[PDB]
Subunit: 158 residues, 8 copies
């Protein structure tokens, strides 16, 4: 049963959000990966977010670009931690994505990651760090992952 | 006297801006309602408001919000009515976050966006009036008079 | 007889504004699609805007980029609703387009849509939503269009 | 004493900025007129002003506006005279909307743009003077004297 | 009563912002510590704090900084715990430098970033609470009550 | 003898400044086109600007990108009108170019045109409009040029 | 007591910022001169100052300017000495024009750029001190002591 | 023995930082070129910076992109002058790089150069100008380098 949900507004976002999916798979974290759009399927979004906790989800990772409302509206309907990935937009390079996700008024948080692929990977890692607080086997796998990241850095450029 | 325009905003702090929309609709004698609806703290209230707007007889919705401003966009997701968005000026980013959060809607769900701040609130009311005037001759006459007086009221030179 | 006018400053804008044209055609809304430039044909613009209402136009959709003055000057000469599409510019990616269209001082409104193709499509949809207020057959077609948009969203990425 | 420069602005609020252009033309003894012309509220007034400027004997137009600042650009569309644009500082976006709305003219219709705010108004007057000085020897002499005094007036060190 | 959240900031000037995180953790009865740790002036203090956080029993770190804001990112480099970052508003660039310095972490080392300023500090505390509530039923109940009261406290219309 | 000088900091700027050169040629305005860099040939710049008037130049058009100082420093050394063209830079797309040219403190003006090719063309046109004030034959050719620009705009997109 | 650092600025208004560089050099007992040199109003003064700096015994130049800030860059064009640039905060664009005008030097002519405003002025002095300390042991000792006291002066927690 | 250290966070930065390496080689300045990342090898960074002076380094040139912390954290651990090169990032074109490097609060300086290749070249030149203060042979070679830069500028575009 999934403990993280990865959701995104459209197929075009998958180029970005696949990096989150891959990282959860590497760390062997059960998850579901779905399309949910705030603007085109608002009722789907409401149902998804409001039932997330009772379905056993622990963390939601949401990616969107442009006027990016998916993470914020997800957080409006759930008490679960919601992590937001600004997807790079064509004209404004994800600056619109970033501001529309991170600038949540007080009371309804979205933990926001970097624009683009880096943010998708880091949303998965941040989700893993949250789950590791109460899953010792995963905490060990995450320690190994971070140790390998550090150890594998070369000493000089090629 | 049933409302044909709804003015909605996320907070009392938004009223400082949205009051200009309210005043202009009153000036033009357009029946309206003015409410607080917040996308993030009352999302079910927003869904209900937007999805029943047409059946309640609303023709246009004017929505104002600042920061990560999601109220206009989520309103438009739930209604076929035209939704006009007013970016409310934010403290740190001067409404640039408000503007981009509102205007940059992906294709399929429009929000007609006006200027940051009081100017945008006034123009949202005027744009709503222009829409209503298409099928209300008396209002069309009031609006043309309003625009004509605006033009006639412009002085020819500045006061030193 | 056209009830929406789509106008743009140059042939290069057509790559963007064709999305508005296509959407009005899909919804079977009679329209005209023309080149009118604020800076190179200002008298053409004045004549077009000031006679729009008496020609039977209900809404004008205007696209321009850079120092984008076409929507604002159109609105100066007509009481019809004017919708503005910021066309993506080469250097500043339509940020100049966006600010020069949306930041109208109070008294003369332009309802502004997103930079680029999305904005062109949405200007046509917003025009349709305006016309639907007093055209029941169109209102039904627009409802169908929005219902299909919502219903056709897949549940997961490929 | 017929004007050779026209200073135009959209509103009385612009005068706080454009007064610096007016003062500098007066200092240099350049005959000018100072008027309010708004692109959006008096578009026919603007068309008439711009299209008759050359025949009225104007040589240069200095135009100031803020926000979606269209006055300089639309002026240039209707005249062959050089048009200089002053971006007036706006409240929310600090004149960045003013600047981009003025300077980013597509090829074919120029506006020579100066700095945001009072500095730009002063420099628009000085640039106009530089243009006129090309075919007015007395003014050329006054302008060179003005620039020379500017340079000579710079102190060698700051006051603590 | 041992702390499970650490709130850290680079300077006393940051406290004006970070106090909102501290207040909210107290409201929700979450044991925490509040400290000054600066990335640039006490880098060894930061390394020691971050690398011992987990063994000291901390579950979440909330870090605030402005300008070239490196404290959250360098904290995350030294710990496996979730690190939440609060961009503190800077004088010249209004926290845009703070925001980009914090949120734009390269892949491999996450910082969950909140809004510029007081809103972000409040939300960092709430996000930390949401994380802790996953494995603390009493806190989960307090947090749901908190969110429910927030929603219920929203008025239906503005005060004119 | 040249009455307009077109100067630029490097060969890479020519892709942009060639549009100014072409326009002056079309209008049959005698000009010179040169490389002068503020940062690498500062003494060349000082000599060029300070002798411009006595050499018979009427207007200088200066293009530069990045920290773009060429127009401003030219204006510091001459009483002639100086027109500045922000050249599009690789990273910041000429926003650095634009701000470093247009934001001249009061006392030393640079008339600034748009980023890129449009600005180069318009600097040449603005120079022509200045010269036309006291050259009737050129004024007529410029009127013809502007009339053709206006007249040649098509009525609809292809 | 001959100066080894020159602090230059375009205007008296810049002194509010550049005074912080002056104070720090004095604290560290580094002989210096503090002058007004403007790129646009005294370009020959600037050329002479920069091109004679090395022969006059200067080792480092600290230059501050705002807006279209050309003083640091043009200084570096005329000298082989290291030139450090301080972006002075501008009214409209908050020093973003100052920053980009200074830091974005094309390859071949460097300006080492510091933060917008007072922080940058202080750091320009400290960076100059770091450069001089490479070949002055007494100053190297004073600078290490200065940095050590900075670190030791950081409190462990904020004052509520 | 190296007197300048060039460090960067990853292999992808080498495309940029190679310009610094080439310039130091041209001026015959002994240097070392290494990978050190603030976020993935923070202990490596601490050791590198804190021992730099005693190893005989005089200047450190550090390049990083995105949330770019490498130069600032290097400066935190050394009294040596640290020069920072903002590497161009994919989405925000190095504006994030630039602000996260240059906006150091008072007390810990980083001398910042332009975004990208230009900044890498100039960091090497600025390092050379620092070293030239107390190395006469290098000072002469740097004078020659700058003289050739100035002298080799063509008089007109091709």
């Amino acid at each position: 049963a999934p403990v993280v949900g990865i959701i995104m507004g459209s197929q075009s976002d998958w180029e970005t959000m696949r990096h989150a999916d891959a990282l959860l798979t590497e760390l062997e974290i059960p998850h579901e990966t779905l399309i949910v759009t705030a603007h085109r399927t608002p009722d789907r979004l409401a149902d998804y977010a409001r039932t997330a906790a009772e379905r056993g989800l622990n963390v939601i990772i949401a990616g969107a670009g442009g006027a990016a409302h998916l993470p914020g509206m997800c957080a409006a309907w759930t008490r679960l931690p919601v992590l937001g990935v600004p997807v790079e937009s064509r004209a404004l390079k994800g600056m619109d994505s970033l501001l529309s996700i991170v600038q949540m008024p007080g009371g309804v948080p979205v933990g926001t990651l970097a624009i683009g692929a880096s943010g998708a990977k880091n949303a998965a890692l941040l989700a893993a760090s949250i789950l590791a607080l109460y899953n010792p086997a995963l905490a060990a796998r995450l320690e190994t992952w971070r140790a390998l990241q550090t150890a594998s850095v070369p000493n000089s450029p090629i």
